[PDB]
Each structure stands twice: as C-alpha cells, then as structure tokens.
Amino acid sequence: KSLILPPNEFLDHYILNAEFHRFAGISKNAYKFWKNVEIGRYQGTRIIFLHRNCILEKHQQALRQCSGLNGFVLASAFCSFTGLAPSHLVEKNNSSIYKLLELKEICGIKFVNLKKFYDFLGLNYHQHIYIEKCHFFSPAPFEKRIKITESMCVGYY
C-alpha cells in the first residue's frame, strides 16, 4: 500500500505522479484521497510513484498517456544503489559510464534503465552491483572484476 521500492527494482508497474496528475487534470495530492491507493518511493527521495493497478477507471485515459518505465529506476537511486557519483550521469561531464547507460527524463526527473545495464553486465536482476574505480581497492594480483571503462569496474554481492 505504501512501499519503499528497493533501488534495484524496476518501475515497470508504476507511473510517475508528477506526470499522471497533469494528464488527469487533478491536483498533485489527489491520490492521497483515493481509498485504495498503492504508492511507492525510493528511500532517498520523496518522488511519488503510483501503482498502475490502483488507478481509477475515471482516469484510465490519463493512465494510457503516461510514460512507460519498464526497467527504469530513479537516477538518484541508481547512484545510491551502485555508489556511482551523481556527476557521472550529467552529460556535460563527459563520463564514459554515462555513455553505457540509457537515460531519460520525465517532468525533469532523471531515470536510468537498470534492466539494460544488468543485461550488459550479464548479471541477474537480484544481484547488488557496485561501480568503482578499479584503482580504488584491488587486493588480488590482477583485476578480476568486470571492467567496463578504462578506469571503472563492477562488483557484486
């Protein structure tokens, strides 16, 4: 009913409230007064997502014009989850990581396609990945983790 979304969980079943209430013509907080309401958020932020099932029939039209979010997560959550520095997701900074990632904005909210990144890494969607400069900690004799950039590595636990 009011869930915290784990940061590695895709927003398939959700729409962004900031966008939906504009299409619907309703108030930003109208969802607080529906009776059966399922919402989600990521721990670090208060951006509200509505579960598609709880949308009213009075509003199914506005639902259908909402952006899809299959495989996506909030970009801030992606950086929280992976430990990647949020600067990398700013195009201006010319990050090699930025270029490996499918990004997207809705109402000025930035999303990352975590599902495609997992596929690129060849990992299963339930693994906790981290992204790190290979230089930072490599005790082993050579680097044994997935290396995706001149300087960046990926590990998991």
Side-chain angles (χ1 to χ4, degrees), residues 71-75 78 89 101-103 110-114:
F72 282 84
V73 310
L74 229 42
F78 179 92
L89 303 194
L101 297 177
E102 173 176 5
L103 307 203
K110 202 192 300 153
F111 300 77
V112 173
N113 191 316
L114 184 51

Side-chain angles (χ1 to χ4, degrees), residues 7-137:
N8 71 327
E9 158 165 3
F10 319 144
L11 293 159
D12 281 38
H13 302 318
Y14 291 90
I15 64 192
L16 184 76
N17 176 61
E19 170 185 76
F20 163 85
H21 88 280
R22 303 193 217 247
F23 292 146
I26 71 194
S27 165
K28 173 202 313 176
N29 304 265
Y31 78 87
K32 306 213 207 194
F33 301 100
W34 319 341
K35 175 172 157 41
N36 287 306
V37 57
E38 300 180 0
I39 66 161
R41 51 171 281 239
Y42 295 102
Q43 169 178 331
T45 59
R46 293 278 163 174
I47 286 134
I48 298 306
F49 298 85
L50 304 169
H51 195 302
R52 300 164 151 272
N53 180 357
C54 88
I55 304 296
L56 315 170
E57 279 73 13
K58 329 166 33 183
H59 286 143
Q60 292 291 130
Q61 201 217 61
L63 174 54
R64 280 181 304 263
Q65 51 201 134
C66 273
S67 305
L69 298 158
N70 290 342
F72 282 84
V73 310
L74 229 42
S76 51
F78 179 92
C79 297
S80 174
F81 184 56
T82 65
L84 179 76
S87 48
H88 289 275
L89 303 194
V90 183
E91 176 141 27
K92 137 207 172 193
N93 294 320
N94 260 281
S95 164
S96 299
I97 286 286
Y98 180 103
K99 143 104 167 166
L100 303 175
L101 297 177
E102 173 176 5
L103 307 203
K104 170 186 186 192
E105 287 196 24
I106 308 169
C107 302
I109 311 302
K110 202 192 300 153
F111 300 77
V112 173
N113 191 316
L114 184 51
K115 189 190 195 285
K116 291 185 182 189
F117 191 53
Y118 273 121
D119 294 339
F120 171 74
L121 297 176
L123 305 179
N124 289 322
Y125 300 151
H126 296 338
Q127 261 156 303
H128 197 131
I129 61 179
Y130 64 92
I131 303 172
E132 217 179 56
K133 295 278 182 186
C134 309
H135 192 63
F136 183 70
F137 187 69

